[PDB]
């Protein structure tokens, strides 16, 4: 559909059978979730935001459903204040910014 | 336009007669620019996200052109890593998220 930006663009996602709220975030290169357990191999990464840098774990080829859309891709996990769907998965689901 | 998210959504802005580049950020409540001199009264504020908080200056009723569309609103100024157009002004220029 079409999502207004008068309020934060929060949507339900589903990952590993858990329901979570995340923010559709054109200002994020990547998808970053609050601390959680995921299966398999991972690698540590440092990402930057508004106030400095945080450490995350990078997991690849994780299935995630984002407002009804099946996606499979990389998920970074760490101390983000809010779950973020970044450009890597917005593109996957066909999301554009229109004005 | 309908902007795709293959690349960071960096666009032309014009503020106080200066040409800059800014990131259209649906993950930001408010607009924050790198340090610059703007006219008029300001108030200090803190804004936060990944990596913690920074101290900014808040100016009101500032004209800014974003990708050709005129806006007038509240502009924060401070140590952000990139000029950021937030929802406050994305709404003004008619932005929605579409998928």
């Amino acid at each position: 559909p079409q999502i207004t930006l008068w309020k934060r663009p929060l949507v339900t996602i589903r990952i590993g059978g858990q329901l979570k709220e995340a923010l559709l975030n054109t200002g994020a290169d990547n998808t970053v979730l609050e601390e959680m357990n995921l299966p398999g191999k991972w690698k540590p990464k440092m990402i930057g935001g508004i106030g400095g840098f945080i450490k995350v774990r990078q997991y690849d080829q994780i299935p995630i459903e984002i407002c009804g859309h099946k996606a499979i891709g990389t998920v970074l996990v760490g101390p983000t204040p809010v779950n973020i769907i970044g450009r890597d998965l917005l593109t996957q689901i066909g999301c554009t910014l229109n004005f | 336009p309908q902007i795709t998210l293959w690349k960071r959504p960096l666009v032309t802005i014009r503020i106080g007669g200066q040409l800059k580049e800014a990131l259209l950020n649906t993950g930001a409540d408010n607009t924050v620019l790198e340090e610059m001199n703007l006219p008029g009264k300001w108030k200090p504020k803190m804004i936060g996200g990944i990596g913690g908080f920074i101290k900014v200056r808040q100016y009101d009723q500032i004209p800014i052109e974003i990708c050709g569309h005129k806006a007038i609103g509240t502009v924060l100024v401070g140590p952000t890593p990139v000029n950021i157009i937030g929802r406050d002004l994305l709404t003004q220029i008619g932005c929605t998220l579409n998928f």
């Binding site: 923010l23 975030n25 200002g27 994020a28 290169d29 990547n30 970053v32 990464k45 440092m46 990402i47 930057g48 935001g49 508004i50 983000t80 204040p81 809010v82 973020i84 970044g86 | 990131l23 950020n25 993950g27 930001a28 409540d29 408010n30 924050v32 804004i47 936060g48 996200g49 990944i50 908080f53 952000t80 890593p81 990139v82 950021i84 937030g86």
Partner: peptide
């Protein structure tokens, strides 16, 4: 609450 979720890849 924080309000600016800029995020840059590694």
């Amino acid at each position: 609450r924080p309000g600016n979720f800029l995020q840059n890849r590694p």
